[PDB]
Chains A and B, each alone.
Chain A
Amino acid sequence: TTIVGVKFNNGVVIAADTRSTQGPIVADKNCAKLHRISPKIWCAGAGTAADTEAVTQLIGSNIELHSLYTSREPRVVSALQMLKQHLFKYQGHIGAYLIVAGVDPTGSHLFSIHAHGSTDVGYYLSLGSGSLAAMAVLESHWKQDLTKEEAIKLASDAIQAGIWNDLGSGSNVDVCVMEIGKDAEYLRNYLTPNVREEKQKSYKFPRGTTAVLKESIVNICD
């Protein structure tokens, strides 16, 4: 699992792969690792794949409730602090590794939250087991005053390096970009370097190939 984030002048952009790995074996080839806390703030998890969605669901519910209570847009700062408190109260027993990016009337922001509660802020940031390869690339190519297409190209290069140089990262590329002026848009399968080729022979079997021990029908409706 590789997730990166790049902060440019107008807004911020993050990216993620689609391969969910439970160890030496791959579970699913195309998954959505990006989690939505609010329509303007996005999160992507790393580390354990089982705490990320639960924690993001909790924070999204509470944050949208807080924004409705305040009758105003949510702020990335409040979400970051809430993740900090939640992860700290469990005392490091949750291995969730999350990225947080968002914009607000105060401006744009991008932070990272570690499993035991540590926090950091940077224009570029990659977290997770496959973060190393992509973060080296972004440290090599990043510069001041990036543009939207330049930022997405840099994120694509970082994720491509991560998927090529690491086993657990590959398949498609999922990218979300945040724009201060306009609405934040979400790209599904933005890059698909891996496409399964057709099989040499078709493994379709003739009808009745396997014997049936017993035939029965179970009712469903009243």
Chain B
Amino acid sequence: AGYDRHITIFSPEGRLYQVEYAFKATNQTNINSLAVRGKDCTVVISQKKVPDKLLDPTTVSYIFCISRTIGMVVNGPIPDARNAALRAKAEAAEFRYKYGYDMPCDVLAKRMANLSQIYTQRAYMRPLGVILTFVSVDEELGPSIYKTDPAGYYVGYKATATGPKQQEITTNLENHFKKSKIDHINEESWEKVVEFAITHMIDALGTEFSKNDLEVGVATKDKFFTLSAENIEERLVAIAEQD
């Protein structure tokens, strides 16, 4: 009968309708973010939209530090993002306890994707409503950006976009990557990649940013942290005076 579209069951076209509708829930916040991969570090920059003046800007953020070495940026409704953050932190804890060494980004991304797949396969569960971008630097592999989805399809990215204008930023970065033929930014300093990402994001969205519209996460060698507002203002001032 018509109960196909309600639960995660196959459809006459061979489609999982619930998982398809889950993706449309990731654009509710219409927050555009992108992450580039530097020569030795990674930086992820996301729009920071504060709807009401009653909000405290410090607490509102879609960037969660999973561990001392792995950072994560998540797009979608925040409560499900926080559930995913809790599970990811707990699983990083469990892996560090059981194996004794800090886990690489790909392992965490694969485990969260497997969890989302278990969510999809079990009928009584509903799929996660978020899209998670795992970002970190792996001394065993190198800088890496990993993006999963509600279905569980994860794959490393040279540079990740998201939000309503994900396609436009994707082409904007693809033109640069296809003209420079390099798989990563050649800028050695984490200082330069931040301005590169901000400049490309500004040219893509066509908007000008202030101290509070954007939140930048930086993952250096064995260190992840979120820059404060003064840091973003200084970066924007440097960009404005440079170009």
Which of A's residues lie within 8 Å of B, judged by CB? 66, 69-72, 75, 77-78, 80-82, 85, 105-106
A70-B107, A71-B106 known; A80-B140 Cβ under 8 A: no
Beyond known contacts A70-B107, A80-B100, A85-B98: 18 more, CB 8 A cutoff: A66-B99, A69-B107, A69-B110, A70-B106, A71-B106, A72-B140, A77-B99, A77-B101, A78-B99, A78-B100, A78-B101, A81-B99, A81-B100, A82-B98, A82-B99, A105-B140, A106-B139, A106-B140
B-chain residues with CB within 8 Å of residue A82 when the two chains form the complex: 98-99
B-chain residues with CB within 8 Å of residue A85 when the two chains form the complex: 98
A80 to B100, CA, bound (A): 9
Q: Mark B124-149, 1 if CB is under 8 A from A, else 0.
A: 00000000000000011000000000
A-chain residues with CB within 8 Å of residue B99 when the two chains form the complex: 66, 75, 77-78, 81-82
A-chain residues with CB within 8 Å of residue B98 when the two chains form the complex: 81-82, 85
B-chain residues with CB within 8 Å of residue A66 when the two chains form the complex: 99
A-chain residues with CB within 8 Å of residue B164 when the two chains form the complex: none
State whether the Cβ of B57 lies closer than 8 Å to any Cβ in chain A: no
Distance (whole angstroms) from the CB of B152 to the closest CB of chain A? 15
Distance (whole angstroms) from the CB of B106 to the closest CB of chain A? 7
Closest to B103 in A: A70
A161 to B126, CA, bound (A): 66
A-chain residues with CB within 8 Å of residue B140 when the two chains form the complex: 72, 105-106
> Which residues of chain B from 90 to 129 have any CB-CB distance to chain A below 8 Å in the complex?
98-101, 104, 106-107, 110
A-chain residues with CB within 8 Å of residue B104 when the two chains form the complex: 70, 72
A-chain residues with CB within 8 Å of residue B139 when the two chains form the complex: 106
Closest to A66 in B: B99
A82 to B140, CA, bound (A): 21
Distance (whole angstroms) from the CB of A79 to the closest CB of chain B? 9
Is B101 touching A75 in the complex (CB atoms < 8 A)?
yes
Is B100 touching A77 in the complex (CB atoms < 8 A)?
yes
B-chain residues with CB within 8 Å of residue A70 when the two chains form the complex: 104, 106-107
B-chain residues with CB within 8 Å of residue A71 when the two chains form the complex: 106
A106 to B107, CA, bound (A): 18
Residue pairs across A and B with Cβ atoms less than 8 A apart, 16 shown, are A66-B99, A70-B104, A70-B106, A71-B106, A72-B140, A75-B99, A75-B101, A77-B99, A77-B100, A78-B101, A80-B100, A81-B99, A82-B98, A82-B99, A85-B98, A105-B140
A-chain residues with CB within 8 Å of residue B101 when the two chains form the complex: 75, 77-78
A106 to B100, CA, bound (A): 14
A199 to B181, CA, bound (A): 77
Distance (whole angstroms) from the CB of B134 to the closest CB of chain A? 15
